[PDB]
Each structure stands twice: as C-alpha cells, then as structure tokens.
Paper text:
To enhance the physiochemical properties of the series through reducing lipophilicity, analogues with polar substituents were synthesized (6t R3 = methoxyethyl, 6u R3 = hydroxyethyl, and 6q R3 = dimethylaminoethyl). The para-phenyl acetonitrile group of 6f, 6t adopted a parallel position to the Tyr258 in pocket B to maintain hydrophobic interactions as the case in 1. While the hydroxyl group position was altered slightly between the two series leading to form hydrogen bond with Leu208 and Arg209 in the benzimidazole derivatives compared to Leu208 and Glu194 in the quinazolinone derived inhibitor. However, unlike 1,136f and 6t form an additional hydrogen bond between the amino group at the 2-postion of the benzimidazole ring and the backbone of of Leu207, which may contribute to the observed enhanced potency.
The biosynthesis of AQs including the signal molecules 2-heptyl-3-hydroxy-4(1H)-quinolone (PQS) and 2-heptyl-4-hydroxyquinoline (HHQ) depends on a group of enzymes (PqsA, PqsBC, PqsD, PqsE, PqsH) and the starting substrates, anthraniloyl-CoA and malonyl-CoA. Both PQS, and HHQ bind to the LysR type regulator PqsR (also called MvfR) inducing conformational changes and leading to a positive feedback loop through the transcriptional activation of the pqsABCDE operon. PqsR was therefore identified as a critical element for a fully functional pqs system. X-ray crystallography techniques were employed in this study to gain a deeper understanding of the conformation and binding interactions of this series of inhibitors within the PqsR coinducer binding domain using crystal soaking experiments under the conditions reported by Soukarieh et al. Several reports noted that the PqsR receptor ligand binding domain consists of two subdomains known as pocket A (deep slot) and B (outer pocket) connected by an antiparallel β sheet hinge region.
Numbering used by the authors:
A (entry chain A), B (entry chain A): 94 to 296
C-alpha cells in the first residue's frame, strides 16, 4: 500500500496525473488530502506512514524524506471588488500587512515562512472554501490557488490584488517529499518522469 | 542619485535591461554589485542608502523596503564530471548533504534558508568564480547561475547534478526590494513595467 498526500493547493487535475501513473506500477494506492498548512506536519508523524507528499510547503530537510520539484502552480491574492486595497496597488500591496488576512490555520499552531500570514490582522480558517466565503463577504483578503478563484474572478465576484507584486499570479513550486526508501526504485522514478512531463502540459 | 544593488546571481544582460530603462527617467544612476549572500545585509545598513536591490535572496519584510518579483533565473548544481555524485542521481541528490559544498560566504556570517549551505562539509568563498575554480578542481560541488556555467558545461569541464531534483535547472525568483518612498512614483513603476517585460524575453 503506497500512501500519498496531496495538499488542497494542488490542482485537482495534477491529482489525476499522479493516480493514473501510480496505479500503472502500484496495486494499492491511497490518496490523502491535507491543508498546505498541515502537509509536512502529517508526514513527520511516523504512524501516518505517508510514502509521498505532494505539497507547496517547503522545509530544508525532513527526517527520512528527500525533496524534489514536480512543477509549479499559481496563487492569487484576491479580495471583494469593493475592498479598500482593491482597484489600486503598490501602496495596496504594502498595506496587505495591515488589512485583515483570511489565512489557512494549522493543527501545529505553527507555519512555514512561505505559508505564515503576512498581516498583523489575521482570521484563521481550515480550507480555501471557508477562506473565499469570508472573502466574497468583505471580511478580509486571502491568497488561494488559481483553480479555486478562476470561476469567481471572471464572474466579478472576486478581484486580484497580486499583479503588481508578481504579474500572471504568484508562482509556487509543487514539491515531492518521498520516503528515502523509494530513492532507487524505477517504480517511483517512473512516477516522477511521467507525473512531471504531464503536469508541464497543465501549466 | 538612484543607488541600485544587483547581486552576482543576476545575469549580466538583466543589468543592461534595468540601466537602459532607469537612465530614460533618472539623471544619476549608481549600479553596485554584491554577493547574493550580502545583498539584503547591505540594504539594511541605512548609510548604504540603496534605493533598489535586485537579488535572488528572500526575507519576509525588510524595514522600510517593499518587495516584488521582477522575474525568474536558473541555478544549476554542478561538479567535476569524475565527481562521485556525478554520472548518477536521486541517491546522489540526497548525498549532496554529505559531500563537500563550495558555498558563497557572507560578512554577516549568517545565511537565509534559501542561500544557507545544505552540506555538513562546506568550504566558503566570496564569489561564483572562486566557487567554480575549486569545483573544476574536484574539491567539492557548487550551485551557481546558468550564465556562469553555460560555457563550462558544453565544454565538458563541468557536469550538472540537479536535473532529477528540478529538470531544466533550479528556478529562482529575482526580487526587487525598493525603498517604500518609490511606492507611488511613475518613474519606478515605469522601471518595473519595462524591466519585467524585457527580462521575460531573456527567459
Ligand atoms: C507567496 O505565496 C506563495 C505561498 N502561498 C501562500 N502563502 C501565504 C502567506 O501568508 C504569504 O502570503 C502572501 C500574500 C501576499 C504577498 C504579496 C502579494 N501580492 C506575499 C505573500 N498561500 C498560498 C495559497 C495557495 C498557493 Cl498555490 C500558494 C500559497
Ligand atoms: C535552491 O537554490 C536556489 C537558491 N540558490 C542557492 N542556494 C544555495 C543553498 O546552499 C541551497 O543549495 C541547494 C543545492 C542543491 C539542492 C537540491 C538539488 N539538486 C537544493 C539547494 N545558491 C544559488 C546560486 C545561484 C542561484 Cl541563481 C540561486 C541559488
């Protein structure tokens, strides 16, 4: 049984890219969904016996796992179109650190530099739905995956704030944390090879 | 006088991209070159009076500067073609943390998570030349900008180790740290707009 973690930030397509290839080589494949904020926390619990985590979250070296880059995805800073920081930028981008942020919370209470909130006014939720609900209502601003805001952006229900910080969305590496034991196993190298070249095409 | 920091990791072309645009708007422009390992350390010294730093190094918020993304460049992990970790990977990638690393040193003695050495066996130098000299000689492995190893790679003088970690080179955001005062100044927004769309073309 190959246990596999995919965080909520990973487009649901890339999750079909993996399972397709994995099931070619492996006979039992378990797919677990975590918050980006809980991915590395989960694999660190030995009893969770995760073999592969696909997550946006970064840490220099986890005990017994190796890291590599599967590809890249795009986050966007979004708010209600009538948000103060909306319809403006550069001073707005800076002010994000003052206006209320709707942030992914974590069981560990802790965050990475990458995922920790930027604003001194933060309201925590558990997933990107509860985030973008409290954002459609103009309670604050949030940063969420492209695939979560594509629908609402063209609808005009949500507006982008991020473009002057990073045009075309904030590029974010997708990392593969794999059990060191998979290190010399064509099965896993087949997964990387395929999973990679397929997730280029989505991008 | 607009003082401008460009770290050694920034291709020398992108440094012509900036100066071209900047000199269109500004009448005195000073261009300082730093180690990536010394960029943010330098702008933090108030007396250094840096107005714009273009550097690969990341920190969540520097006092009085705002951050944004200019674009992306590619580092490669390189070694002597007869290096043990050479002509191999995945276990080799993991072993990088054991074999000797030739690392950029810093006046502050300190490094960011991004720039800190990965290996327990590290020999510090001051620039990418001294790095790739001690690497051509097989004293250790190093990670250097594409533009620094393009020549030597096709020559066969150096080999890439990084490809199974991140195919096509390890993508690295180029950051613009700009004095908050430039925040609402078409001059600076002109620089970003131009500098960005021009540095897409190099990539
Ligand atoms: C840099 O984001 C990529 C990683 N990432 C986060 N991180 C949440 C942190 O609280 C930082 O949020 C920031 C918001 C604004 C700026 C400037 C502008 N504009 C910088 C950082 N949340 C994410 C959600 C989804 C994805 Cl794919 C990546 C995410
Ligand atoms: C992740 O690198 C991008 C930032 N960056 C560094 N950082 C030097 C650190 O000691 C980490 O070196 C690593 C070497 C190997 C691996 C896995 C593989 N393969 C991961 C990290 N040095 C750089 C030099 C130039 C540029 Cl453009 C970026 C650099």
């Amino acid at each position: 049984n190959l246990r596999v973690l995919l965080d909520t930030a990973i487009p649901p397509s890339f999750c079909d890219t993996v399972s397709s290839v994995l099931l070619d080589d492996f006979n039992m494949v378990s797919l677990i969904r975590t918050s980006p904020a809980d991915s590395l926390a989960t694999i660190k619990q030995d009893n969770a016996e995760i073999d592969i985590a696909i997550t946006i979250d970064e840490e220099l070296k986890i005990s017994r796992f190796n890291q590599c880059v599967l590809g890249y995805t795009k986050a966007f800073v979004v708010a209600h179109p009538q948000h103060p920081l909306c319809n403006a930028s550069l001073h707005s981008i800076a002010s994000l650190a003052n206006y209320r942020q709707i942030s992914l919370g974590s069981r560990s209470g802790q965050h990475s530099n990458l995922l920790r909130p930027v604003s001194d006014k933060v309201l925590f939720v558990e997933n990107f739905d509860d985030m973008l609900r409290l954002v459609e209502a103009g309670v604050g601003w949030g940063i969420a995956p492209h695939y979560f805001v594509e629908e609402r952006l063209r609808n005009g229900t949500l507006a982008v704030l991020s473009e002057l910080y990073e045009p075309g969305g904030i590029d974010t590496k997708v990392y593969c944390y794999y059990n060191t034991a998979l290190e010399s196993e064509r099965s896993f190298l087949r997964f990387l090879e395929s999973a990679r070249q397929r997730l280029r095409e989505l991008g």
